[PDB]
Amino acid sequence: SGFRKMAFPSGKVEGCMVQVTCGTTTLNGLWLDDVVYCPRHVICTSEDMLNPNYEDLLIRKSNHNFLVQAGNVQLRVIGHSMQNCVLKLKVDTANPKTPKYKFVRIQPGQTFSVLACYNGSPSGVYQCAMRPNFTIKGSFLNGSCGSVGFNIDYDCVSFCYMHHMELPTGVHAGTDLEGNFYGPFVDRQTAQAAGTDTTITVNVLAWLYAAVINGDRWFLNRFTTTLNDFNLVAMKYNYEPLTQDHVDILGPLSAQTGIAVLDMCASLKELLQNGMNGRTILGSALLEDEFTPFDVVRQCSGVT
Amino acid sequence: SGFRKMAFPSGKVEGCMVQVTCGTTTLNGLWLDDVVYCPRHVICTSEDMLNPNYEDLLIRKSNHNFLVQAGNVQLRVIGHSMQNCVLKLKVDTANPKTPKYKFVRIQPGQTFSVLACYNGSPSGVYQCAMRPNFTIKGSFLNGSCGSVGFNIDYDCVSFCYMHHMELPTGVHAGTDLEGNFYGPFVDRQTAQAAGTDTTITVNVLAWLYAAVINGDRWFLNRFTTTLNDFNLVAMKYNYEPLTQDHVDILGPLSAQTGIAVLDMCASLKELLQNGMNGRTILGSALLEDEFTPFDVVRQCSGVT
Ligand SMILES: CN1CCN(C(=O)Cc2c[nH]c3ncccc23)CC1
Numbered sequence: 001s002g003f004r005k006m007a008f009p010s011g012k013v014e015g016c017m018v019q020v021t022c023g024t025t026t027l028n029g030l031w032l033d034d035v036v037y038c039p040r041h042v043i044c045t046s047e048d049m050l051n052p053n054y055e056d057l058l059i060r061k062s063n064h065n066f067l068v069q070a071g072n073v074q075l076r077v078i079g080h081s082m083q084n085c086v087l088k089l090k091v092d093t094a095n096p097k098t099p100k101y102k103f104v105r106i107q108p109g110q111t112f113s114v115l116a117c118y119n120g121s122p123s124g125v126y127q128c129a130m131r132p133n134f135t136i137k138g139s140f141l142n143g144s145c146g147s148v149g150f151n152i153d154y155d156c157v158s159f160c161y162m163h164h165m166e167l168p169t170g171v172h173a174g175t176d177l178e179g180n181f182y183g184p185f186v187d188r189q190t191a192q193a194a195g196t197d198t199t200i201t202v203n204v205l206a207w208l209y210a211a212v213i214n215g216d217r218w219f220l221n222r223f224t225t226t227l228n229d230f231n232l233v234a235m236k237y238n239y240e241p242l243t244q245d246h247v248d249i250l251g252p253l254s255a256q257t258g259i260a261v262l263d264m265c266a267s268l269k270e271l272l273q274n275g276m277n278g279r280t281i282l283g284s285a286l287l288e289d290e291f292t293p294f295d296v297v298r299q300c301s302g303v304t
Numbered sequence: 305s306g307f308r309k310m311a312f313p314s315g316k317v318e319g320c321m322v323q324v325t326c327g328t329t330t331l332n333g334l335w336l337d338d339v340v341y342c343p344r345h346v347i348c349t350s351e352d353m354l355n356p357n358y359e360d361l362l363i364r365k366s367n368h369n370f371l372v373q374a375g376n377v378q379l380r381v382i383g384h385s386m387q388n389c390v391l392k393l394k395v396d397t398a399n400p401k402t403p404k405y406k407f408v409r410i411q412p413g414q415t416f417s418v419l420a421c422y423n424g425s426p427s428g429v430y431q432c433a434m435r436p437n438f439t440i441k442g443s444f445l446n447g448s449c450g451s452v453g454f455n456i457d458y459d460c461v462s463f464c465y466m467h468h469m470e471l472p473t474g475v476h477a478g479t480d481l482e483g484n485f486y487g488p489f490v491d492r493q494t495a496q497a498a499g500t501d502t503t504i505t506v507n508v509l510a511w512l513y514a515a516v517i518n519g520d521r522w523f524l525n526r527f528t529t530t531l532n533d534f535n536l537v538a539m540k541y542n543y544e545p546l547t548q549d550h551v552d553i554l555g556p557l558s559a560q561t562g563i564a565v566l567d568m569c570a571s572l573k574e575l576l577q578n579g580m581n582g583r584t585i586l587g588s589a590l591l592e593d594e595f596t597p598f599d600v601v602r603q604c605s606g607v608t
């Protein structure tokens with residue numbers, strides 16, 4: 001019993017973190033096999049950051065300009081390339097701690113763990129969601145760039161995020177491990193505004209199910225709704241529309257609790273309309289949207 | 305920028321987790337040097353759990369009755385002893401992944417990371433606080449016993465908690481690594497009620513400072529208070545009393561923000577009296593009390 005914002009165990013990823021220095025800038029890199037992945041803005045001066053031409057800046061850089069340190073031992077760089085917004089530094093040594101891994105590009109609403117790192121050393125781990133506006137609400141200070149987001153399936157680390165920048169609103173933007181930004185963001189020091197940060201409705205419903213499973217049931221009501229009726233209310237409250245694909249994904253939680261998805265939607269509808277009236281659900285005074293239905297089943301079943 | 309409930313990187317602890325089986329019960333153990341630490345209730349049948357005499361039950365157990373598996377390799381048990389509520393199984397092999405470590409008994413209000421484990425395998429990591437009633441609000445299912453709470457200082461893991469049981473209210477009780485329960489709890493399947501779960505005032509104030517540092521300032525007011533005046537209000541709201549030791553610990557956050565501790569107390573006083581009025585602080589609709597002043601400085605400074 002109990003329900004916590006839970007991160008994946010970070011050890012498999014800790015074993016991949018290194019320090020990358022180009023000139024006076026140090027940030028983090030991800031060492032998998034004989035490649036080190038890092039944000040391309042490592043090559044930029046503060047001046048360059050305002051309006052960088054990365055291809056032109058990169059011409060001035062050689063393998064020996066990329067200093068890669070794994071613990072307190074230097075790796076030899078034997079190649080470099082730019083893929084979208086990441087640099088791939090080929091090193092002469094395969095990371096001996098390379099886990100089974102994939103690179104995945106996640107959808108908005110998907111959660112992942114972040115291993116916040118500075119100078120290639122882990123500082124902490126927390127759980128994030130890719131927001132519907134393709135930002136993440138992380139905890140990142142200068143030097144945290146190259147920190148990675150990931151999910152784990154038994155022994156396979158799926159890398160989904162690499163940290164690149166903070167927007168002037170203090171929300172975070174980054175890439176997949178192919179170097180493609182989530183959302184419309186660019187690695188340039190220019191004011192970039194985020195769109196509407198809507199609530200991840202299917203995740204809220206997952207968390208309401210988690211609440212029921214954990215004995216927090218006060219919000220269960222006598223009502224039902226329809227997807228169309230629910231969605232009118234969702235749109236009014238800047239909630240993402242619910243689709244039958246969302247209802248399908250909530251099936252196992254529906255079956256475990258015996259609460260029809262549309263009934264739980266009607267409960268959610270009343271919470272939106274009435275608020276919490278000073279009550280809490282799983283120790284929260286707001287509706288939590290950074291647990292996926294998969295997250296709730298995993299936590300509630302004890303997958304390792 | 306941004307402020308997250310952040311756990312320590314768990315890799316150093318992942319390397320210590322093993323599976324302990326006695327008869328038909330499997331739970332987790334902590335392998336440090338040539339000792340495996342686990343809850344003594346591993347020796348109990350369901351029947352035994354109702355009113356166990358652990359010394360008498362342990363007489364019936366030999367070294368070869370304790371099955372210790374590290375990954376998928378069995379460890380040879382060459383000794384066993386009971387220290388308070390934990391068993392110490394001496395094995396013939398030092399854990400090669402043993403980190404620098406200490407055993408510490410934490411105070412109520414102190415935070416720690418939990419590596420939730422099942423069958424000696426990590427499932428996830430989250431941040432907890434020792435509640436003033438000596439419970440923790442964890443996320444633990446059957447098989448999670450022997451999971452450990454810890455803090456890390458650079459390269460030294462301080463182990464502070466080992467999970468033993470859930471109370472009928474679904475809150476959690478456990479021991480330090482000398483086997484002494486936090487609070488009045490006993491490892492027996494008998495109804496045990498928790499006392500008042502008061503709010504950790506110094507932690508709320510730490511988190512308000514964290515909010516100011518991160519640009520959430522709407523709650524800063526024109527008022528000040530005194531420790532005695534604040535404490536009258538604290539007691540009314542089931543907040544822990546604030547002492548000058550708490551004010552001392554908040555000094556660095558006071559200095560960083562230029563907000564006198566007693567001014568922040570007066571802000572907190574108004575939040576208690578007025579509530580949040582549907583507003584949030586660091587994405588929370590309630591006052592968060594599971595960040596210590598040390599946690600806030602660490603996260604806000606990027607210690608690795
Ligand atoms: C292209 N350019 C954009 C601006 N940059 C950052 O925002 C880096 C960064 C990521 N998280 C942070 N948190 C606090 C302060 C700075 C950062 C550098 C790269």
Ligand SMILES: CN1CCN(C(=O)Cc2c[nH]c3ncccc23)CC1
Nearest residue numbers: 345444445446468469470491492493
């Ligand atoms: C002395 N006896 C007391 C009762 N026990 C537990 O509560 C073990 C336990 C710890 N977390 C849990 N979460 C869910 C279900 C069970 C547990 C066994 C030991």
